[PDB]
Symmetry: C3
């Protein structure tokens, strides 16, 4: 089934031609397709960061999307590329190394195949650039309407490598930092908490108001809020939270009355 | 009226998925549309910088463009999003916080509405991301051909918040720095000045040649020139001016014989 | 001949609107065209870096591509813009300052013209922005199907300025660094070498395994490999090579048994 929108993520950066050569390959295979970057600024080899960036992609993108993603330090080894159709009807192509984990949490795999057929690859395949020659190439063939079954053998969904994700029990942790603004996102869902005391940084205790948005406190002041989808977040109104309280992903966050 | 080209600016950066999720929403609503970034590297919350970046957009882009822009620290408050048709026939969508000021100077507002209708929003609207759920969503509905009147109530052009812009009287000031090259742009127009003495930095006095272009002086040497549209500028031939004379926006520049 | 794909490179960065204004001009002229960035992060004025980034573009992109590239410190002087049809049938537009050198090595010029006709320029042409008003504008006219002969007078291929490129004789040198990962690329071709001793950094001698890919050594360990097209490269498995051995382009690399 034609999937005319390719959404593209990698760790190769956008500061040289690498990411663009992949687009060249994709436009060659699927001249009817639109290519849009998710980002190419995933930290090098950081599969978990890439996985986090993909989490909300299935929901925000239409059904005719191919999610093409690679953070692939295992390029040229036995770790295969996989192609997946999800419950929304979107297609996903990436290394079977955990990268697609959180995107699949959002919309589960319905059918999954290993990408082994030379006919969906850019030949000759260079061992160090499976990202271009297998992931990007296959994504474009699928965008063009190639049968998922033609990419290679079917595998069971459990054969898709998944990254563990910690759940809040209220004790949670920092999942990621929105580096543009310095806002801190936790794994604490809306329902578990429904001024509060927040414990982090030599047992830092902050008394923070729970707000709907940034502007409900004065400029530079800290706030708690529920972020763009259902998770507790910390920020400063028009300032950078991690410049005041330098927390990293994995650090514990406890919220109590 | 269909406006098949969406030009997109924000302060969310291009180093994670945020800006891409907005594009996902827009492609979902307007599958016939082309989306092109202006930039997402506006300094966080810096409405004036965003406004400056938009100034030359109306002239450079065709009439069938929707200018979709958000630098929106007031997200989730009483400061509304507005939708505008300009004199060129382009559409603009952004927060009513001054962001569109200089784009509107270039091509004035003809009709303006507040974006209040849920039917042009991405539901449910998250208080902290009006950028995606109102600005981007509405821009896409307009691109798809939604009547401007359908977005919400008409307002008078004077209800559009405008950022003050200093005029040269020759005494002017630094407006912006082209950070890629370090060239300094002033507010001094072509007609007011038509070697010269330039006073800035402990009363720095420079004797500079007025040139048409960079290569009219030797490499590394300073020059005065009229920039890409009618304003006096300072640069070094194949070097970075603000690395030699570290001026910031707002600093006074006086030019005399 | 219509060339519906414009691949776009410059040194103006993607952190402000400059690169986007060029796209505005191009979309205005060629509304049927798709514009994809190669990169805008070429170091300022660095023609050689830009040239290197373009080298693999002809091969990776389809025949209906216009390669639009400018790193143009000679803007507004006697150094003209040129338009070229290559052996693949692609079109290229850029300053005649060496920028297109390595792209032309990959697919030689068949026909070349100087861009002198006002009718393929964005009028009025600003002396400091030939990149937008001549290079981008002309690229779009060619994309739209303008006869190459209409841009200006024919020149001989030898009138295209070329950058010298050092050949390996095994003694070679560092050509470029993949800054995303810190991998080092040399000019040493596959055939000249077909554990090895590598001499660089106070006569640094390393004993390195020759591998097909990164994962064939333990994490953090150095390796030799043949890169994404036929040249000897140095890297660390999931680490940054130039953070351990800080080599720059031009530095000698000797490989021996
Ligand atoms: N030095 C390296 N070590 C391990 N993987 C690398 C290295 N350089 C690039 N890669 C990987 O190559 C992949 C592309 O095939 C990238 O996604 C990247 O993770
Ligand atoms: N910590 C913050 N304080 C104020 N505004 C913010 C913050 N983080 C993000 N935003 C704003 O949210 C907007 C998107 O709705 C962005 O344009 C940005 O300016
Ligand atoms: N200060 C400068 N000196 C020389 N060239 C410049 C300068 N600033 C911008 N340019 C050149 O202008 C070109 C666009 O016409 C860019 O490719 C850039 O190389």
């Amino acid at each position: 089934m034609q999937h005319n929108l390719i959404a593209f993520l990698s760790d190769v950066g956008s500061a040289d031609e690498a990411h663009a050569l992949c687009k060249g390959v994709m436009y060659g295979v699927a001249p009817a397709a639109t290519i849009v970057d998710i980002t190419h600024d995933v930290a090098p080899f950081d599969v978990r960061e890439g996985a986090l960036f993909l989490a909300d992609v299935p929901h925000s993108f239409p059904a005719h999307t191919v999610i093409c993603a690679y953070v692939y330090p295992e390029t040229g080894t036995a770790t295969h590329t996989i192609a997946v159709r999800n419950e929304k009807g979107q297609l996903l192509v990436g290394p079977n190394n955990g990268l697609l984990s959180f995107a699949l949490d959002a919309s589960p795999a319905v059918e999954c195949h290993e990408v082994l057929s030379p006919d969906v690859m850019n030949q000759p395949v260079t061992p160090t650039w499976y990202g271009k020659d297998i992931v990007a190439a296959c994504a474009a063939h699928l965008a063009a309407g190639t049968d998922l079954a033609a990419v290679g053998p079917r595998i069971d969904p459990k054969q898709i490598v998944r990254l563990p994700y910690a759940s809040a029990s209220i004790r949670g942790e920092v999942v990621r930092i929105d580096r543009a603004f310095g806002n801190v996102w936790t794994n604490i869902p809306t329902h578990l908490i429904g001024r509060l005391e927040v414990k982090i940084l030599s047992d830092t205790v902050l008394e923070l108001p729970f707000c709907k948005t940034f502007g409900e406190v004065d400029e530079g002041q800290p706030l708690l809020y529920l972020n763009s989808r259902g998770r507790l977040a910390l920020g400063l109104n028009q300032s950078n939270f991690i410049e005041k309280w330098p927390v990293v992903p994995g650090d514990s966050i406890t919220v109590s009355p």
